[PDB]
Design a protein around this nucleic acid. Sequence first.
RNA 1: GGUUUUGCGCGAGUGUUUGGGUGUAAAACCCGCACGCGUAAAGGUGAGAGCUUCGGCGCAUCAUCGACC
Lengths: 236, 117, 40, 129, 41, 67, 50, 52
Amino acid sequence: EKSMPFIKHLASSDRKVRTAALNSLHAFLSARQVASALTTLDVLKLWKGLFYALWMCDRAIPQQNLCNELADLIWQLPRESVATWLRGFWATMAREWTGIDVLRMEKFLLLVRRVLGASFKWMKKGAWDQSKVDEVLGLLAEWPFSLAEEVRITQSSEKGGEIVQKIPVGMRLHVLDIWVDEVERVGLLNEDEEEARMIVQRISDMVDALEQTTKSPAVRTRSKDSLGDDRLPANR
Amino acid sequence: HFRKHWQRRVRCHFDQPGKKVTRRLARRAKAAALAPRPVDKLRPIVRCPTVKYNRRTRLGRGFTLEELKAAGIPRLLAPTIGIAVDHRRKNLSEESLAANVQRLKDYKARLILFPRK
Amino acid sequence: NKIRAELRKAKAARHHARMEQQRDLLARKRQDLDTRELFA
Amino acid sequence: RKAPKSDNVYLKLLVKLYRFLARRTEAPFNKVVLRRLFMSRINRPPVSLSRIARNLKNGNEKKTVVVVATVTDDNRLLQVPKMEVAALRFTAKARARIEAAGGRTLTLDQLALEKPTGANTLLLRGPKN
Amino acid sequence: NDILVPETLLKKRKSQEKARAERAAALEKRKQANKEKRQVI
Amino acid sequence: SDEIVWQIINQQFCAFKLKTTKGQNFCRNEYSVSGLCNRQSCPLANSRYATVRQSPKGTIYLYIKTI
Amino acid sequence: RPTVTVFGADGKPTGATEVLPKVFSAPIRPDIVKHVHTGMAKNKRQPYAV
Amino acid sequence: IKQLDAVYESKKGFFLPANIVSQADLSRLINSTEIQSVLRAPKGEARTKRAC
RNA sequence: GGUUUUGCGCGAGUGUUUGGGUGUAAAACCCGCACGCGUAAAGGUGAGAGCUUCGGCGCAUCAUCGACC
Ligand SMILES: [Zn+2]
């Protein structure tokens, strides 16, 4: 199996140890032969240690630069393994959504916005790569804006196990409040581009599906207000 | 049930931690005398009498004469090498006999004997 | 004596019933991303 | 009432949670769970795995079964269905048998986090005396 | 180096903004109903 | 676990607690903004906290604690 | 927290870390501790009478 | 610290107890996006002005 | 030694402390076989808390008719 000796140091109580381990994870992702062979089990180890990297970081401006540095890691990876990396992020942050306390939730809510902000930035090359389009939005249909309450991880065989991760409701309500802010930031809401109106529409149809088919009252009111914002092309 | 003088005949047990120390010191005092030998003698495997406890099995008092002769241990040597001997018990079945001459054969394998003088 | 026989057999069957229940509880009790292994 | 009889700090923590949910929500579910948190042990009888299974025998599956009591295991039940149980306490055999069947185990604070109004829940009570 | 607003604080400010416009609208609805009631009594 | 820490300090025992018969309780912790044992001004129960203290050289410092 | 740092003889961090065991994540129950400690402190006592 | 996992596993008749509360930070339970999205509007303030 | 109620642990099981092991030694920590108590040796209809895709499900408990020993 792969040698990953820096995950231990990402949980250290010293910042220079944690900084060195974060610089060491740049080298692991840069090695294109290993990075093209990252598995779902492999990325789940990385984002767990990356979770405790942000869990340990102390002050506000350190928290923002780390959130941005964890955001600009999608560009480091090859194209063959970008999909499983984002799978690791949404699965790890599903596992520990409730377990974050009220004071450390601020920097992890920023991490979801920065990662989802990086995903819409990645899908830029019709001036938008359609192969990248089905990957980001398809993974937005699996964890945040889903119709099932569980996501199945890995495949059932004699060599594989079983991981079933519930999507928490709180993750749904956060992506609902930040998704318009992120597509504005990278520039989907330019009304001239016909391709851009297509991408805004298909996620807008996706959340509208979550509106009519959910059972949580919390999702129902929060998704309606996300549709009703004035910046959207339909409500303008 | 306090019709008689239960005040004059009540016994407490504050020596319970102290008697345990004495009992463990008696086992250490005994093992100082019998330094390479085990403290307790070997005892046979027997079946409990009644219908309630027929399925259970416990340690008896001593080995039968037929058990000792089948194992190859002479009778007059067995008390001097740590084997308890019961003359009252009889075998009465081959299952009681075979379980104990296996136990004595297993004792001899694990036994190391030192010459007299 | 046929009466005193079956009180004794009832108590024996009650005791054997308890001992079989003790074994069955033992049989029933017999039937990498972890934190203690990742940060080891 | 005015105060829980319990001395568990975590049971006082749940009462603080469900005093807020009873006050700031129209849902009658939060009012009855708060009243059952104030109750004593003889007024919170345990619920076996068999009793939960026979209230799921109709189309009540895919509902979060919620019980303000301790869920116990029933050896007379041979097969356990898949179910999401939310309760105060789970016994060790009951927790393992729920998880082995593919089900799930919740605490009451996780229940209020997931469904604060008690949507799509199924309240059960244990047998009295 | 600007230290942006906490994410949970942003949800308060949007909830507070909707509450203020609701209170202002309910105040004007209450004022006009009181003016009509003084004429009718 | 800040609520659990408050339940041990308030109900059971705190080494910094001074109890008077005048109706108010006092906090003997040197890192307390007000010397009172209420929830909002406990340096122990509050994982994030601030206080102001004076050095004997005359300098006033702002002490910030983060979780 | 996953790990705890191990400190050297001089007081400086050695560089090795140990995983915190699950017993540090156990519930903290002051009512349970008080009840046990009350009866525990009685167990050393030595009898007195007149 | 290495032995602490082992000594608490070797205790027969006992397992590490399950808490009745998973998240003991009550401020996270109450001041969450999921709880605060569903609440009724506040019926009053902390201090109530004397009417008459 | 009975009994009622509250708190607490565990839960169809529960109880280490007669005793053994160990110890910084009347403390604390550990448990091999027994033993005490206990458990074992699914129906309809109508009310009914709660939920709800507003169509309906229906806890506990009560009542009424059934089922089986
Ligand atoms: Zn205090």
